[PDB]
């Protein structure tokens, strides 16, 4: 049948041109029944047509096609244990997804596929129903209803062929579990192929570690009960004898570095075979070769096994490739930060020979910077160059600025209000800026700070700070005096090493003191400064301005930032006065912390802490009485009331400025006082020493699910604080406050738990020793952040 024209009826999405091209028949050619059938089948196979009918009109060949309705949405209902996103991913992987059409005959196929997925995940009685909702313009919505049913769990895990080790011990190291006691959360009792493979690998590694090189897993069997509610797993294995590592031999194109590889391969003859050591030696050889430029030093190790003597000899083949040079270094994704910020953290230099360890170090430094979420590295090859490569870093940025405010309560502080704002990356330049303010029942504090990290190419940092403070000691568990100060500081910082840091700077401060009730130590200090106040009424004022030089060193080597298991930390700070200032003195403080694991799993651990501090004047003057040290509390020595250990106060018999009955006054001349009065009000001292030892245990009854957010420990802490200027001879009727041998000791227990709201801490201690004059407290509760 000759065809003069081609016409279509029902085309909505597919263009006429596409249909004409897909049709083997074209205008101006003879057509028979076979060609029409072929065209119909081609239209059906397009995947976008439901019904097709190619008939012949009077002169024109007319095709009626009913397009499959376009899928507009896919809804789900009954996916409790299956997330909607993953199910949609599976559906689109199968082929059905949004935008395509719906085949009105594959509903059963999709339902059975989803049922098979439910069978794989564990549920075997699941039912899936598909509902079709037509909508105008030949659209359709496919809804899915799921009856999950009941899942299945493992009822027994058995191993056959093992004699040296009990089955329970082996299962103890398996991810899959068969018993879940209510008092412990060890894991779910579901079955997964990935978990089974992990358990098999763990068993193989466990057997190999003991020298069972010939260990082989014969097979694994999984069975279900007739009710299909229980899973039984069996493993058939074969444990053999052990083997010894007779020696190691190396042969290959070592490139003249044979002398430096023998030391790495040294071993003790007769040592047990171990693959981890072989891998470590291969990695060490690769790193040694790469230190000289080579990028791909292929290394292969093959063991030769002699069963007669049960010996293993390792043959090492080394193929060192050619040197590779770096032509360019590219950064992408830094839409906010400028190029220099990322480029100054690099360890690999552009235009030099390649080293992979340097690239890894640069990636680690970028990750540590904290401005990005994810960091990836790629090493592309230059087209046509056999020894040229380019290094590309891909990063994703993160928000850095922050603003905070809040309220809190404290036993002695009362109601506290705090606020602040900070920006760690100012306009993508690296500058850091911050402002903070705080107010409680006895002090007000305002702080502003700016910092530039790279003041020099090497990495020296420069910072400045301004502060205003107004404090009263009325409710500070001390004597009474009001201070008002303001000052500024400038500092420079040097990264002397990877694990060490140094700081040096200058500072200026202005202080004003008022409301100084008559007392012994304060009057002694004022006399040393030259002032001559009377001992009759409390009315004084003292203004001073000081310039000081500050220095400090820090060493950090912890293995973690939270709940560390092994490491040490040391901090030292010091301050000196510059000539030309009213005051003249020096001050030094040191803190040390250390951790030590006991077992091989780093679980039972020991913690040690020490804190020391000393300062004094230089030119015969005295150190200010507002720079003294205080000991006693929940941070220095638990079991005692805050700021209790140390010398006490002594008041002159004096007349109060305004006496009001129904109250009490210390050594009041109006009341009839005529001699110095002893008391129990802490004043402080200019020398301190505190030590603490703690033993940290895993947990009483919690499981490995959340074993990284709780801690329990028993602590024993000792301390003391004293003043070295107290004159014992003149005042022989009061304790000796210049004796550094009245060490307080205490012991107790503590528990800590990280919570989404804050780090809740509880502790209970009982001071088995305490000198007279000091109070004591038992329970410490910390609920919230700062």
């Amino acid at each position: 049948f000759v065809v003069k024209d081609i016409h279509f009826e029902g085309l909505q999405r597919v263009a006429v041109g596409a249909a004409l091209l897909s049709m083997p028949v074209r205008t101006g050619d003879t057509v028979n029944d076979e060609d029409i059938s072929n065209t119909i089948r081609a239209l059906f196979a397009t995947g976008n047509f439901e019904d097709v009918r190619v008939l012949r009109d009077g002169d024109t060949l007319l095709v009626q096609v009913k397009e499959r309705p376009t899928i507009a949405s896919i809804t789900f209902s009954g996916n409790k244990s299956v997330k909607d996103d993953m199910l949609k991913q599976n559906l689109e992987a199968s082929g059905v997804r949004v935008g395509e059409s719906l085949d009105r005959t594959t509903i059963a196929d999709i339902e059975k596929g989803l049922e098979d997925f439910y069978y794989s995940v564990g549920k075997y009685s699941a039912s899936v129903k598909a509902v079709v909702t037509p909508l105008p313009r030949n659209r359709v919505d496919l809804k899915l209803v799921f009856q999950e049913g009941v899942s299945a769990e493992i009822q027994q895990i058995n191993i056959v062929g093992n004699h040296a080790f009990t089955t329970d011990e082996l299962i103890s190291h398996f991810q899959l579990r068969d018993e879940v006691p209510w008092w412990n959360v060890v894991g779910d009792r579901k079955y997964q192929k990935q978990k089974l493979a992990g358990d098999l690998e763990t068993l193989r590694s466990y057997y190999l570690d003991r020298g069972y090189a010939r260990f082989n897993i014969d097979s694994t069997q999984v069975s279900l009960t007739p009710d299909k509610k229980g899973i039984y797993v069996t493993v058939n294995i074969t444990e053999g004898d052990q083997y010894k590592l007779s020696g190691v031999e190396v042969s290959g194109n070592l490139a003249g570095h044979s002398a430096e590889i023998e030391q790495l391969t040294k071993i003790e003859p007769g040592e047990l075979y171990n693959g981890t050591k072989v891998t470590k030696m291969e990695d060490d050889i690769k790193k040694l070769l790469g230190r000289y430029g080579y990028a791909y030093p292929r290394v292969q190790s093959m063991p030769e096994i002699n069963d007669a003597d049960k010996t293993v000899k390792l043959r090492v083949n080394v193929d060192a490739g050619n040197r590779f040079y770096v032509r360019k270094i590219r950064f992408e994704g830094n839409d906010t930060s400028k190029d220099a910020v990322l480029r100054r953290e690099m360890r690999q230099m552009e235009g030099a020979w390649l080293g992979s360890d340097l690239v890894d170090q640069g990636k680690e430094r970028l990750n540590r910077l904290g401005f990005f979420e994810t960091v990836d590295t790629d090493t592309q090859r230059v087209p046509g160059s056999p020894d040229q490569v380019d290094v590309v870093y891909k990063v994703k940025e993160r928000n850095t600025g922050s603003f905070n405010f809040g309220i809190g309560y404290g036993t002695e502080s009362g109601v506290s209000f705090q606020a602040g704002v900070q920006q760690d990356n100012w306009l993508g330049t690296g500058y850091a800026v911050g402002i903070n303010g705080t107010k409680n029942d006895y002090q007000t504090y305002a702080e502003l700070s700016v910092t530039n990290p790279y003041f020099t190419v090497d990495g020296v940092s420069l910072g400045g700070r301004l502060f205003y403070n107004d404090f009263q000691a009325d409710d500070a568990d001390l004597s009474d005096y009001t201070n008002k100060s303001y000052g500024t500081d400038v500092t420079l910082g040097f990264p002397i090493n990877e694990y060490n840091s140094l700081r040096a700077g200058l500072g200026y401060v202005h202080n004003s003191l008022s409301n100084m009730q008559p007392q012994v130590a304060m009057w002694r200090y004022l006399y040393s400064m030259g002032e001559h106040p009377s001992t009759s009424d409390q009315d004084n004022s003292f203004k001073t301005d000081d310039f000081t030089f500050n220095y400090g060193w820090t060493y950090n080597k912890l293995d973690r930032g939270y709940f560390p298991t092994d490491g040490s930390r040391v901090n030292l700070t010091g301050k000196v006065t510059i000539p030309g200032s009213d005051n003249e003195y020096y001050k030094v403080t040191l803190d040390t912390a250390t951790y030590v694991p006991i077992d091989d799993d780093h679980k039972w651990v020991v913690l040690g802490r020490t804190r020391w501090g000393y300062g004094d004047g230089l030119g015969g003057k005295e150190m200010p009485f507002y720079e003294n040290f205080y000991a006693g509390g929940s941070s220095t020595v638990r079991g005692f009331q805050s700021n209790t250990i140390g010398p006490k106060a002594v008041y002159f018999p004096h007349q109060a400025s305004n006496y009001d009955p129904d109250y009490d006054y210390e050594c009041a001349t109006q009341d009839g006082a005529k001699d110095l009065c002893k008391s129990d009000d802490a004043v402080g001292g200019n020398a301190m020493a505190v030590a603490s030892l703690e033993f940290i245990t895993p947990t009483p009854f919690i499981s490995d699910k959340y074993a990284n957010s709780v801690r329990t420990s028993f602590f024993w802490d000792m301390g003391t604080v004293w003043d070295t200027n107290w004159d014992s001879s003149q005042y022989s009727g009061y304790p000796d406050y210049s004796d550094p041998s009245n060490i307080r000791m205490s012991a107790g227990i503590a528990l800590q738990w990280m919570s989404p709201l804050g780090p809740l801490v509880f502790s209970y201690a009982q001071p088995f020793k305490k000198y007279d004059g000091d109070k004591a407290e038992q329970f410490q509760f910390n609920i919230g952040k700062t």
Partner: peptide
Amino acid sequence: WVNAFARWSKSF
């Protein structure tokens, strides 16, 4: 001793 705080932080 009842040291406590309820502070919120909001990134900006």
